[PDB]
Structure formats: structure tokens, C-alpha cells
Write a protein that binds this ligand. Sequence first.
Ligand SMILES: [Mg+2]
Length: 69
Amino acid sequence: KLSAAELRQLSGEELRNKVRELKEELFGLRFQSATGQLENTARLREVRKDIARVYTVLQERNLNIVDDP
RNA sequence: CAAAGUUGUGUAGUGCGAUCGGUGGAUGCCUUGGCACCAAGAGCCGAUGAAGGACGUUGUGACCUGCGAUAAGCCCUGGGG
Ligand SMILES: [Mg+2]
């Protein structure tokens, strides 16, 4: 569970690196789910919620909802 | 013993009554649903793309509800526990 408060302290480039890392983790989780692995099925949804959190932070910086560092 | 005579008939089935069941879903009692109104609102939405949908969306098979690849959900804010 990422926190939007922490992500709001990160800068844009590290936030996008976080987006890409989360996408890669979701890819790996889906492959494990397909192949019979993945005991931890909650992380499969939590990584997508984390992607949503990072997108919310990035877009609120883009739309000036919160000041962009 | 023989004669003459009389009377009787359920081993197939059936009727009526009682009794015991089956089927059926009436009756009674209800209700996550309607009907008729009352009081207060609100009286438009849409190219910043509507009304209405198609497809997808859950850990997993479908459907309803919600949502849209940020997909039964993301953030801020107040409440509450
Ligand atoms: Mg019945």
C-alpha cells in the first residue's frame, strides 16, 4: 500500500519510474497468476491501486491542484 | 335311498360409506413489491461531448449493481467509529 502523502514528496521522474516499476510488477503478478503461482492474490489488485495513486499525484501536479515541485 | 319343491351365490369386476394416503396448490397469515396521494424541493442535460448503450472490470465462472485500461474503484476535505 503506497501512500499519496509520500508520493507527493517524490519528483516527477522518480514518480514515473515508480509507475513503470509498478507496471512491471503487475505484469509479473499476472504471469504468475496464469501459470499457477501467486499465493498472494491481494497484491494483484493493490499494485493497480498503487498505479492509480501515482497517476493521481502526477495529474494533480499537472492540473495545478497541488503545487508541482 | 329316489322324488317333488324351496332357498343361497363376487373366484372377473362394480357401487356406496368410512378410513388411510398420493397428487394439486386453493384457503388463511404474511411481504425486499405496487397504487393513490400529501408536504417540501428541483425544474433542464449536451461539442469541457448528452439521454441511451456496447464491450470490459472481482482472487475465481456467470448475472445484477457500481465503475472505465487510475475500471465494486484513485485523491482532498469534513463527519464517524
Ligand atoms: Mg405442492
